[PDB]
């Protein structure tokens, strides 16, 4: 008989080249672990929901105001209604009866460039606008001589004594809280501009998020800046929109599945078929 | 050093259990093949598209009319306009600027109970009522006893001397190809009540299918109605409906897609906000 | 718009920003006393002041301080004291202007000859820049057009020092002509280098030191700081030299820049019964010029305005102050407050209306005892509606409110009012049948505007040919044409606009001010255009005029800037002229009449369709020449139109003072090139003590009105009998027998549009899509019932919002913080478990993260992840039907299932799981009463005495404790928390814990760079049938 | 009372602009229309799959023979063994106990870049190749000069006297029905100077299926070539794989359900976890 593969890997006298590298958890061994720190370590040190973001996203200790900072992005990003493309989606998928997981999952690929874009977007061109020279007057000009909108920037009604008032607490946190702030600075002198432009182009929360994001890492401790832009250009702040507004998708389920909404129907006359005459 | 496990089990003198048994594909080897079938002795025998998903999902050679009436069955299921639930997922999720893949997911993750259920369902009641003696007159006041409507009748505006007409393709091919169609006969009993008692509640295109593709299974050769029992038992009802609307589905993204038409956005009239007053 | 500013800040821009050879002295050397500035900090920080003879004037916009006296010359430091105590700060007059003498400048006094002041001045005209220089300087300059070189400079011209000195320097004094040469080029170029309207330096002491600036006089264009803010930086405009200001005034002034909207006030008399609440601009002037006209000069209180059409609680603070005022003093002839306005093009009246009546509803007490009677005249969208519950409002408060439509005249309620009538290669033709137009600039309601138009008229084909955005990739979007639905193909670059559409000539330039200019110049190099309407207000005068230059090269029509539009009935309209389809099937102009109208302002052309619409056939063309000071093509080039056009019979003119243009009328009629009787009247007749610019004596409404009356223009006295001289001249014209009345066709008719007929309430449309958990309109989001400010400032964890978005509740301290810990422990557990590895494939396979995250979460299902919401109903189940946990483990024994939550695989006992431990201390310390996790305790307590390792899980232990945190805390009724329990609240708790760990898995194999993962061949066993 | 809205509409006294423009079905009226194709004419005019693909997808009346390719396309794509990405996730996924939609779906997302996105690269490669002039031994040359693969180029083991043979069975149904085959002659041109580098690196089924796409849109009739590259540039050859290996994953989906194959759990000398020592 052959020997057995887990006896012989015991006396180790054999390799097997292990794929699957990972680096965020260790679920076997006594306690769990999540980067070096157990769960118990977790737990009594204080540290949040956005403490363990830092653990599993980003592999280390973030300090305490940029956990709560986290825990805030979450907070505001967590739902803006039932009209807007990827709720409507849970709401269409949760509504025909299926689990909370298909229909949180059928909202979720809504999330892509044209929803849920504006914070990855709006940060990867402001930042590489600032770590490229470029003062706030060219940077607007610029982007109106190659013709494209500012990604994070335009509100379709909040314009002058009238913030977007999820803008102001995030700022009112940055400003109080984050060490330093360059890029967040350069956010508000292109805005101070566009602003004057037309009243209504302040900053949005999708902008604002991702300006401060960006600040967060590469102002804050423990990233090298070569590597605080390795997340940014990943799409860790895609990952900010999608486990903040998986919190109102699934409430949006729960929502309609508490209400007892049958089957939903499109009406036909919100169509208007261009079907070919012959084909 | 170790003993390499590629080569300490080349000479074998190692065993390992594998997991993940499979059957259809085995894309080792000199060539293809399906289920004993050679890709080659696929094309070369004249087997059609519901050839290769008889070998794939049933594993078995079906007849030519039987291959010819699953095709049929995926023509009938391709689409069925823009205004039903899961297609309009899929526009949604298209006009939002996501792939094909994730605009095809969306809208697949809606095919549950309520929408593209009708087929699975409206088999196992079917079935479910032939092999456990009930007459006709019987099963119609049974179900109106504990108040079921019968899955797979019932059409909106089609009754008498006006029929579905994808209904009558698949009736005629039916009655002209197969050998022998007891589970129809008692399914068109049952709609001969039915239409008796309101003229609209004709056979849907959800309910012949999934008749007559149990009838399919357990009125040919190669299936011994325990084998042809596990198939409708585990779901390869819903199978032929979501291969089918795979088409439509992804032509609506191609179409969507191609009209170069923005984000989508609900209107805010269409919601009828019912929030508490203060929680 | 020409604002002036201080010559202290005229003398500090030259400072800064000549060139020239010349060596300007006194750099910098100016003080400033402001009459209220301290006596040693100015003494110390110019520290030049106790080296050199003084001078003193006032920098508050006085003209002429050589004549009157307001001037301190060639003192030292104390005379002057003492002549600004006679001074610094109380009352002082010039001419009639009266006020406080604020501001004082301090120069260093040169010393000076009567050979060597000198006199310069560059003012912008149309065609041009003049500069204009005198050499017997001083005051005594005499007349300015005969002795006084002038030169007129082209624009996008240089100004050469050879022209300086050949044309300009011929009188100059030859010892000090090459450094004048330098000198006025240098300033020149100064002048509009910066966007100078005006320039004045005089006098000029230029000696053989050099050149002394000493006294200027300077007009900026305050419309192009975008340009210039830069370069200004802290500009400055004083307002004139007049009285204070009230403290209502400023808060209007500082209610102005609260919401994009023109709120204006300025008091004529704060003891004066009639009062004026006016929307739009040109109406303000037309009714202040009928009320002076009619009496109530010495008794009209202001000259209020409000256009933009504001917010219902911004026009009630408006109107707060305007209804406050005339409470102070009452008058025992009575009180008159009067709504007036022309028809708003678009806005809805009604609104409007409710936020006027709700200011008149909520002052109704003083108003009851004032006596005062208001009179009100509106048109536009709905303006019926508003009249109706404006007189409602005026029966409930008990002030007399009469109330007034659009067939009325709309300066009749203010003779009404007081009582004295008793109470009841230029083209000849631009748009023609078929012109279509190109539309710049997304505006979708504009151009819906524009097919309905052409739809209402009859006409054939649409006139928008195409659109061009220059922010989005070439589309097609989907209008109306009539009740069917059209394509129009809305482009990015214009080349491609201009190629695929050929026979375009109109384009509609709907850019903003500061991108109208280099989009109308890149659309002059396309010839296929010939006219071109600029809808942009506030563009500066210079790119004006440079767009002025080049369309009378290119021989290119352009109507505008601040321009609404122009209409031809049957044929054209451009944008939003006219209003909507109500305000033109009311004046009916969806076909051709006989009378064609010229207006500046675009507010007015409205009321000037009324009145032609009202008294005669209809208006065959009507076109609004815009605001701006230099309007792309005149009055006179429009006249001239019109009398080369055989379809008109008669041209109405609506002028207003300034620019030398209706005397240009007068030539046509005195050399007899206009033959077609022409009504005008000159609104603006407030002489009784851009647009308005350079006024001399003969820029007046009263000596133009004289001029085109002796001219032989049909003039009216006022403007209430301009739709009466209308008439009469009408009634000339067809019973002489040349205008014949076409008879009325009936036009098609038009559905209405679903927006206004929804916001307006006749029809109601059955809403789906029932939700509860959020509510992004309005002001603030709000989440279950609270703002999201009060979700932030009562410190309200994320447990705090998943109580709010999925239970819509408010739940403890205690129970966000264990829903908070409960996704925490939820977080991740590794990748060797299911739901992972399909995120780390899927990663692994180059996706997105929603792809990868979305893979990984379908996974969660009965198996894995589905321990949770199957602990807590089997607990749940055993524990409502009474079971004592003996019997419960037997009766799961015997129906031969495994108690679900409970059994771990290597840690048992004194070996606990370690994150039970944790949750299971803080529901003992922190929940109020814990039934069922005492009940899973003892099952727990029995089948860890089957075998050590049968514990409580953390998927089994998070779903009693849920269930226990829903049914035993406060604002859960156990039907509400069983319910949520059947739905699956407990699987989105896993669901959303476990993303955290997907996203993490993903993020990591993308960050460690790791490729395609194939299955190895030798885990498989392919058990294929043999052969089918 | 207010007017009820289906009554003001159906008179006719309203607009409502109507969203969600579409032009591949009709399911109102008579009866079910594809293009301008209604469903008897489909069924009765003897087209197949491949027909209603080209009514779907590209509404257009394709040729006998374009339809039979594309159902031969559908045909060799069908599966390719349970050990690839895509089929590894489904069969996770119906492992795991879940549905028919949820393990097809899960299996469907990973269908990217690196999987299944030879065919759209493979055809956009070449395309862009032939129709800029380039011969193909400076096209192999300048792949060669910037560092990039060939997509559509390599197999593992077949390199002559031992083809694809799947690939030559397209291979020969595209030399014997198509009537002009350009770009095929150009991709296999560059194949034979690929292979006589190296003899393995063979025209795959992905770089076949891609180049004879292309070349069937931009040959047969009823397709002008620009709006023939809009079909490519939008990604419809994405969606031949994706219809095609639909079927082999809801295969593999039945199959892992018939043999009640239990949860999957990888092993853990499988990981090689690398966590941080201290975070
Ligand atoms: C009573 C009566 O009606 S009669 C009085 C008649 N007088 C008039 O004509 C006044 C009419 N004025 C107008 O209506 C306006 O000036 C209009 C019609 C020209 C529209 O102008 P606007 O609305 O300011 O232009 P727009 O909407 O394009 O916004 C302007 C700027 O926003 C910028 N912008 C917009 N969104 C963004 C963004 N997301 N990021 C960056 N920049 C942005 C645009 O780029 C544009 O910049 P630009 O000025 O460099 O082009
Ligand atoms: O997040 C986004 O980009 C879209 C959204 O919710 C919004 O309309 O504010
Ligand atoms: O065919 C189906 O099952 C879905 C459908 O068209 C309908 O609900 O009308
Ligand atoms: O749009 C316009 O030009 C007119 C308008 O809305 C208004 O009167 O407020
Ligand atoms: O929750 C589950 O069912 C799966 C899980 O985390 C575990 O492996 O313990
Ligand atoms: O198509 C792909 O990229 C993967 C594939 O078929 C295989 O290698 O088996």
Redesign the interface.
């Known amino acids: ?5 887990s006896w ?2 015991e006396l ?17 061994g ?8 157990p ?2 370590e ?2 009594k040190e204080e540290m ?2 956005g403490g ?2 830092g ?3 980003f ?3 973030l300090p305490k105001y940029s956990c709560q900072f986290i ?2 992005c ?3 990003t ?9 709720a ?2 849970t ?3 949760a ?12 909202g ?8 849920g ?1 504006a914070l990855d977007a709006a940060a990867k061109m402001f930042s590489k606008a600032f770590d490229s020279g470029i003062i706030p ?1 060219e940077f607007v000009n610029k982007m ?1 001589k190659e ?3 500012i990604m994070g920037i335009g509100h379709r009604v909040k ?1 002058i ?1 009238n913030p977007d ?2 803008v102001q ?1 995030l700022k009112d946190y940055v400003r109080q809280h984050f060490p330093a702030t360059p890029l967040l600075d350069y956010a508000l002198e292109v805005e101070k501009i566009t602003t ?4 209504n182009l302040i900053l949005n929360v999708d902008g604002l998020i991702g300006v401060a994001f960006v600040d967060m890492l590469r102002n804050c401790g423990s990233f090298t800046r070569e590597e605080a832009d ?2 940014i250009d ?3 702040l ?2 900010i929109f ?2 903040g507004r ?3 998708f ?10 007892k ?19």
Chains 1, 2, 4 share one sequence.
């Open positions: 008989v052959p020997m057995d593969y012989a890997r180790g006298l054999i390799r097997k080249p292990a794929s699957f590298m990972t680096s965020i958890c260790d679920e076997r006594q306690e769990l672990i999540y980067a070096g720190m769960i118990t977790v737990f949040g929901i363990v973001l653990l599993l996203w592999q280390k200790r825990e805030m979450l907070m505001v967590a739902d803006h209604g039932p009209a807007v493309s990827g409507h989606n709401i269409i998928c509504r025909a009866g299926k689990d909370l997981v298909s229909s949180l999952t059928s979720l690929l809504t999330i892509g460039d044209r929803f874009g007057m109106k013709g494209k909108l314009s004594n008032m999820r607490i004057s432009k037309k009243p390795e997340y990943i799409g860790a895609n990952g999608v486990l998986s919190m109102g699934i409430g949006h389920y729960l929502d309609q599945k508490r209400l909404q049958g089957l939903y129907r499109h009406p036909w006359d919100d169509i208007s078929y261009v079907l070919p005459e012959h084909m």
